[PDB]
Design an enzyme around this catalytic site. Sequence first.
Site, PDB file in Angstrom:
ATOM      1  N   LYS B 163       0.811  -0.952   0.143  1.00 39.70           N
ATOM      2  CA  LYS B 163      -0.041  -0.350   0.008  1.00 39.70           C
ATOM      3  C   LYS B 163       1.178   0.958   0.127  1.00 39.70           C
ATOM      4  O   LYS B 163       2.450   1.115   0.804  1.00 39.70           O
ATOM      5  CB  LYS B 163      -1.369  -0.216   1.347  1.00 39.70           C
ATOM      6  CG  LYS B 163      -1.316  -1.024   1.053  1.00 39.70           C
ATOM      7  CD  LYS B 163      -3.192  -0.783  -0.100  1.00 39.70           C
ATOM      8  CE  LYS B 163      -4.121  -1.759   0.364  1.00 39.70           C
ATOM      9  NZ  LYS B 163      -5.141  -1.570  -1.102  1.00 39.70           N
ATOM     10  N   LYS B 263     -12.300  -7.717  -8.317  1.00 39.65           N
ATOM     11  CA  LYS B 263     -13.376  -8.446  -6.886  1.00 39.65           C
ATOM     12  C   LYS B 263     -14.704  -8.069  -7.664  1.00 39.65           C
ATOM     13  O   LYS B 263     -15.083  -6.984  -8.094  1.00 39.65           O
ATOM     14  CB  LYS B 263     -13.018  -7.005  -6.367  1.00 39.65           C
ATOM     15  CG  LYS B 263     -11.795  -6.561  -5.208  1.00 39.65           C
ATOM     16  CD  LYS B 263     -11.752  -5.544  -4.630  1.00 39.65           C
ATOM     17  CE  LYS B 263     -10.001  -5.031  -3.955  1.00 39.65           C
ATOM     18  NZ  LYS B 263     -10.259  -4.052  -3.312  1.00 39.65           N
TER      19      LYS B 263
HETATM   20  C1  LIG Z   1      -6.387  -6.524   0.413  1.00 37.45           C
HETATM   21  C2  LIG Z   1      -6.881  -5.385  -0.017  1.00 37.45           C
HETATM   22  O1  LIG Z   1      -5.375  -4.363  -0.362  1.00 37.45           O
HETATM   23  N1  LIG Z   1      -7.740  -5.269   0.278  1.00 37.45           N
HETATM   24  C3  LIG Z   1      -8.353  -3.663  -0.548  1.00 37.45           C
HETATM   25  C4  LIG Z   1      -8.304  -2.479   0.445  1.00 37.45           C
HETATM   26  C5  LIG Z   1      -9.525  -2.997   1.416  1.00 37.45           C
HETATM   27  C6  LIG Z   1      -9.158  -3.185   2.405  1.00 37.45           C
HETATM   28  C7  LIG Z   1     -10.692  -3.414   3.640  1.00 37.45           C
HETATM   29  C8  LIG Z   1     -11.758  -3.210   2.802  1.00 37.45           C
HETATM   30  C9  LIG Z   1     -11.896  -2.558   1.517  1.00 37.45           C
HETATM   31  C10 LIG Z   1     -10.447  -2.651   1.064  1.00 37.45           C
HETATM   32  C11 LIG Z   1      -7.903  -2.981  -1.527  1.00 37.45           C
HETATM   33  O2  LIG Z   1      -7.189  -4.386  -2.567  1.00 37.45           O
HETATM   34  O3  LIG Z   1      -7.953  -1.717  -1.929  1.00 37.45           O
HETATM   35 MG   LIG Z   2      -6.618  -2.272  -4.747  1.00 37.19          MG
END
Ligand SMILES: CC(=O)N[C@@H](Cc1ccccc1)C(=O)O
Ligand SMILES: [Mg+2]
Lengths: 367, 368, 367, 367
Positions: B163, B263
């Site tokens: 991230k 997703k």
């Molecule tokens: C695993 C991860 O990084 N999931 C989301 C971030 C996320 C976390 C929790 C709830 C919603 C989105 C994404 O890929 O943007």
């Molecule tokens: Mg993402």
Amino acid sequence: MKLSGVELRRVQMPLVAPFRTSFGTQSVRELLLLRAVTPAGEGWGECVTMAGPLYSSEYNDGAEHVLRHYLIPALLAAEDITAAKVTPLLAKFKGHRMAKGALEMAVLDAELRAHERSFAAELGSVRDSVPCGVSVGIMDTIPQLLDVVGGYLDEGYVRIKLKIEPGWDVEPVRAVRERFGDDVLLQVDANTAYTLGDAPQLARLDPFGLLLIEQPLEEEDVLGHAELARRIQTPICLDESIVSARAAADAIKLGAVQIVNIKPGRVGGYLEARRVHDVCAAHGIPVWCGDMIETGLGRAANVALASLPNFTLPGDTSASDRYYKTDITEPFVLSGGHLPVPTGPGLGVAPIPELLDEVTTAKVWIG
Amino acid sequence: MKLSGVELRRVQMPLVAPFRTSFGTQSVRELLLLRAVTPAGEGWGECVTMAGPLYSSEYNDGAEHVLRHYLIPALLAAEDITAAKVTPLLAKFKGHRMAKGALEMAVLDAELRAHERSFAAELGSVRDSVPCGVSVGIMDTIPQLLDVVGGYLDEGYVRIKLKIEPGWDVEPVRAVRERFGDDVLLQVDANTAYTLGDAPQLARLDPFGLLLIEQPLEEEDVLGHAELARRIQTPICLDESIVSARAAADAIKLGAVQIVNIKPGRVGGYLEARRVHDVCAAHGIPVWCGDMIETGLGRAANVALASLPNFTLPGDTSASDRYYKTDITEPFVLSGGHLPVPTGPGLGVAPIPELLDEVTTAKVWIGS
Amino acid sequence: MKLSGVELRRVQMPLVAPFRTSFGTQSVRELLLLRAVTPAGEGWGECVTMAGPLYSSEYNDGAEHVLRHYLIPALLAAEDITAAKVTPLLAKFKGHRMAKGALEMAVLDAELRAHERSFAAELGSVRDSVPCGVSVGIMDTIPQLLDVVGGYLDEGYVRIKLKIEPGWDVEPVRAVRERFGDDVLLQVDANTAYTLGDAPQLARLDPFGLLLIEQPLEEEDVLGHAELARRIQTPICLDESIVSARAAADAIKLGAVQIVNIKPGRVGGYLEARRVHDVCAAHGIPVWCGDMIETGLGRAANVALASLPNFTLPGDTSASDRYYKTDITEPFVLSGGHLPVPTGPGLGVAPIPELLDEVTTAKVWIG
Amino acid sequence: MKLSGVELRRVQMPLVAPFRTSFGTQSVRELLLLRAVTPAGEGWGECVTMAGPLYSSEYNDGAEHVLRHYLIPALLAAEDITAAKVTPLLAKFKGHRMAKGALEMAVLDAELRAHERSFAAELGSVRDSVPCGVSVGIMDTIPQLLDVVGGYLDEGYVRIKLKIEPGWDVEPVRAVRERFGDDVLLQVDANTAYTLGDAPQLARLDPFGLLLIEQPLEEEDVLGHAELARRIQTPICLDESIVSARAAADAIKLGAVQIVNIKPGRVGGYLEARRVHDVCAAHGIPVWCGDMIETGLGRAANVALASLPNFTLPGDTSASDRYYKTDITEPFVLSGGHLPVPTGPGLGVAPIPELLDEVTTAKVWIG
Ligand SMILES: CC(=O)N[C@@H](Cc1ccccc1)C(=O)O
Ligand SMILES: [Mg+2]
Ligand SMILES: CC(=O)N[C@@H](Cc1ccccc1)C(=O)O
Ligand SMILES: CC(=O)N[C@@H](Cc1ccccc1)C(=O)O
Ligand SMILES: CC(=O)N[C@@H](Cc1ccccc1)C(=O)O
Ligand SMILES: [Mg+2]
Ligand SMILES: [Mg+2]
Ligand SMILES: [Mg+2]
């Protein structure tokens, strides 16, 4: 499932009337059927090849040979089989899409019967019946064409398609329009009979309000169709060129097509046909279900496919009696211009053994 | 299949460690679950909303409301239902994709259980297991990041995603490369935190060989991404912008994307997700399975989806224990960097009633 | 000229060493030869099919069937045959390009022999010998690859081509460059083994100065190659995709290809091959001559073809002994890295009857 | 084949009626003929230059000079010679295409005669006769134009081409349409007489259904023609601009042309002409055979060239008596709107010595 074996049969079914296209005239339909046998039960497939390689490079004896020596043995050698796994198990063999599609169809029919699930449910049906058009051959004279078209309109077919070729295009269209008017849904199909140089002749179809012109140029000439679409007003529809979902995407991006005819056998099966449907829908390209004069087996699968959401134009899946006095399954019967989607497990129909035996010319067991 | 009703529950599951993204920090996962009840049997769906509208406009109370007052009643009013018919039955309602997806998931689970058919078989699985990566949050310091990444690499995860946000991009990336080397599969994810004006900062990621950068700009800025792809060497991946198979085709044609994160909740369900997969495959665009910190229910469906042929990069479907000490289902356990695809009917997993009850905050019954 | 008949033979010739590609391993070359008989004399054609449909959809039994039942009867029914007319006489049959090419080759050899004219003179040769490269298969280990490559370089081959596939690309290339240096002419061939998603792995070939990468993606994926060419530095060459002069023009216009591999059987014959050459030359696209492990018959026609003006890169037409201990014709022998262009009438070679009989497994007359 | 020498002759042949174009009026055709002499036998070529540089930069005295001092000596200095090798032997000399083409034609006629092979066979003929149009000059009045056109239509010519220029475009076209109707195949040719600023005047031809408008703008203005094609409905045909197969490919890619007039002398010979034909065919661009008021020698070679597969519109190869009371060969005679493709070796025709001597004005031997 474990595939135990496949029975292959050759069938010959006389047509109710001869059917002429730009590649020739057919009075009898010769075809290959497949009966896949697993320890749990059986499934039926149907190959859409014809006797000789006039529509595509595949033909009955060639499909039979490749099924017997390459495709069926590859499936018999695998441990678990599912319809979805048929594609990667056969991927090492180039082409032979119609043959692969038939084999996939038989596997899928057996798999879905074991889950008590219809083709319609597996493919993603959203309606219980579908509106049906009819494909009308090249005739010796204009009055004979108008009699035939008038007859199909009286039976309740919702759309008319005319086979065309050089020397039979603008006149038959003009005549159908003069006799039956501007509100009949009307289209034409050249089965590859023109070249780009014929663009001025095809532009003479512009005033007649056709829904489409289907495959005016050769199979491999995608750019040529896109150039053709810049010179004529009638929307282009592709049939022969659409061999895969990837081919559809390519043709769409190149501007070569506005409407797609989907024939499951031509694209390598019902599972690829659904992918073609989904690729087209994502690009705003309507689809319609093509016909290869199938028996009730293929017809039933086609009617199911045609009940998917992006099939927004009437298909060529006519009633059984448009082609055959007696089908090998329970026949499809037109009712208010529609055919009902089958509700049983798998295809929802199966061959009537005495009728199938009457038209069987040969059979072999591969096991 | 007639739908008799749906039970909706709110669940709160503490995370094993806080998970920080460019839109904030999460220490507990709050979610909505759906139990569809038919005369023949039940099916489970899971909504991927969060508590507030920080990732997208949809959020838990909003999804709950639209499900109760619009979406579930429209399905209860229909005679026979199938998972495919859910879409045209709900088409009059604009948006609310994650809510619709959850509902479809539950209907599909029930339908497929009745046919003794797995999600994997329905979706077109060609494999029995899938390679799994991990998503790693923003940290307070670099040494803390390298510890966490080293830990996941020792557990056998095959790919690392970081991230990122302004003030945490180039340095963490440089540090992961310096410590673990050039052969680690590595990518980054901004969750919409940059603008096109940041292109020079994002171009400083060029020398590090990243697989991709995921959703650098806002959800609606597709042309902005295509312009960004002309200024940077790292392949663009979209997440938030890919709301549908049509959105994927549009983005592809515009040059905005080279790899797609799928997703299922974000696109309105598993059936749209398969369509996204097929659209992408037809254009030569690889896809990978995204993760919204689902329970075992969503996780199971995701693992099945991730076993399709065009999922050619490792997904974010990590083991249950990456997120949760104890899952509400039988847990997914990493083995040789892979998770096994479930083999039972439907999702192939179901909530363990005592575990589900421990984390249930609220429950309501809609229908008969 | 009227065609009197065609003898079809199946031949099996053992290879000096097994030859491995991304689609499998060959230790024996099974092929179809054609002897066309006309009132003006005989001519020889060679089909480039293999036993199964692994490189393309065509294969030996399928080519045999289509020649016997469709193609040869269409020529026998014709009033005048000339090699140029073979194409419109067979145009009603879709595809079967390798089969058609073989038949065209035999007709052309008979026709040219009657005029005491060489293939080279008919095709437009501008030189008397051509520089030859060699195609090197996938090996079990790197040291084995470097031995084989060093051996070909000592024999005087002017260019090395490596078969590649996932798991055997960047390493064999790096190793050949480390051992033999940057001045060796070097290229790779995937025979369709990659997808667009493998663009990063193929971009790792960039630093090695390859002449080209041949057919990285599948046959039908032209747009994919054009996208690939935007992501990698190595020039793209197409083989399988180039099925016609029209296909070449399309691929060129779409940016999918910088160099074209011409194989005459793949495009439907020597006359179409010359058209592919000329289309490519008009767009500034260099060509080179491909190889399908032909006997001396095909080899001789390929060497003549490779002497045309736009064949500006070395071909895969290696010496006979690169494949066969004993050829069925006089063998092609490498001299200073070149093969001589044949000078006699027609192909300029013919089978030695006792050698041909030793390797013949079946024969049939179609008259 | 070693070239022993070439005899160059100048010939003057009165026309049956003066022939007016936008670049002037011709009443007598002055041309250069070449007789190539080899130890085996002879061959004839014909240069399509005129007396002054009005159609292109080449003209009779210039062609004669370059042939004598550069081109013929380069071929005499070459030990080994074939028609295909003429191009690289002369490539160091820039331009002079018509001169090179004439010399290639003579060499090819001799070579093919030695193999007892026709031009038609060498070029790839697929038919035994060709449909012939006629080119009609600018007239003083409209009634005179209609008389001439009605006369050609009564003789059986299948298509009418009108020479046009500013002051003689829309009116003559309108009048031919009013008198003879919409079903006559009708086209126009400006020979470079307009500019892009005349687009509105040329757009006034839109309602008359012309097959094409040939070379409206100057030779070098390829982009101008593409712009013009965006402003008018009549398809653009190029003549003067198409100097090579590469030029054709360029013009096609730029959108400057839809149909191509092929003149073998203009492109540097019959072998380049066949390449133009093949480049155009690969892009879906129809071709037709142009005419430079040749004698029977050029006419025979043109008729053979016009029998190739992509010559799908009628050419300007009119009967001998359209131009000449008495030809120097056996005359071409229209039959059912067609001319027959010659069947003998080489050109299939040769000059009648007494007739040739009657029109010869000068002769020289280069040896
Ligand atoms: C695993 C991860 O990084 N999931 C989301 C971030 C996320 C976390 C929790 C709830 C919603 C989105 C994404 O890929 O943007
Ligand atoms: Mg993402
Ligand atoms: C119904 C019909 O027109 N089918 C094919 C043509 C065809 C003709 C004969 C036999 C099979 C198919 C088509 O759509 O092109
Ligand atoms: C010499 C060579 O590499 N030939 C083929 C492959 C091939 C191998 C065996 C038989 C036919 C084709 C190619 O260029 O793809
Ligand atoms: C038959 C004709 O119109 N020929 C030339 C004009 C021309 C006239 C006289 C001599 C040479 C060319 C053209 O097509 O441009
Ligand atoms: Mg059709
Ligand atoms: Mg190759
Ligand atoms: Mg002209």
